[PDB]
């Protein structure tokens with residue numbers, strides 16, 4: 001059966017204003033009587049995300065491949081829920097997804113892009129990705145401007161795709177929000193078949 005709700009993902013560097021923009025969009029949709037669930041990745045839904053939290057805080061040392069696969073497993077454990085919501089007509093707004101998986105691991109950990117993409121192959125594909133673009137310039141494992149710049153580069157792997165909407169996120173919060181709302185209004189309203197990464 002068809003996907004009735006719409007699925008919006010935010011991407012961007014650590015300091016790009018995703019939680020503010022994703023929150024404002026959720027508010028906006030609820031105010032237009034759209035039913036909507038706000039999700040983010042990584043999260044601590046299960047023991048998998050608890051391990052990810054220790055990694056981010058540098059409490060444990062993990063191999064590149066080990067952590068990369070936990071980040072993907074954290075998404076797969078939400079596919080039943082995301083499929084169910086979208087089937088019912090409930091929208092999903094999600095802060096980070098598989099594109100973070102690929103950009104952070106290939107950029108910061110120098111893992112091969114294709115190897116990074118494989119485990120997320122088959123995830124539900126969003127309707128659109130808003131990339132909050134903030135050039136990095138002058139607590140957590142990847143917080144260090146040179147590492148941010150490496151990840152800024154690997155994020156360009158997706159820059160040419162039809163679903164990828166670049167948003168200049170150096171602008172005023174209100175103007176970024178208005179730009180995002182303008183784009184969301186363009187989304188097709190009718191139900192559609194589910195698509196999957198990396199189609």
Ligand SMILES: Cc1cn([C@@H]2C[C@H](O)[C@@H](CNC(=O)Nc3ccc([N+](=O)[O-])cc3)O2)c(=O)[nH]c1=O
Pocket residue numbers: 013014015019041042056071072096097098100101102104105140142
């Ligand atoms: C979903 C996903 C995310 N990531 C990285 C590591 C971490 O989970 C995230 C980057 N960290 C942040 O964006 N940190 C952050 C800290 C403070 C704020 N803030 O609002 O002040 C916002 C973001 O993105 C990653 O490496 N692989 C993944 O699959």
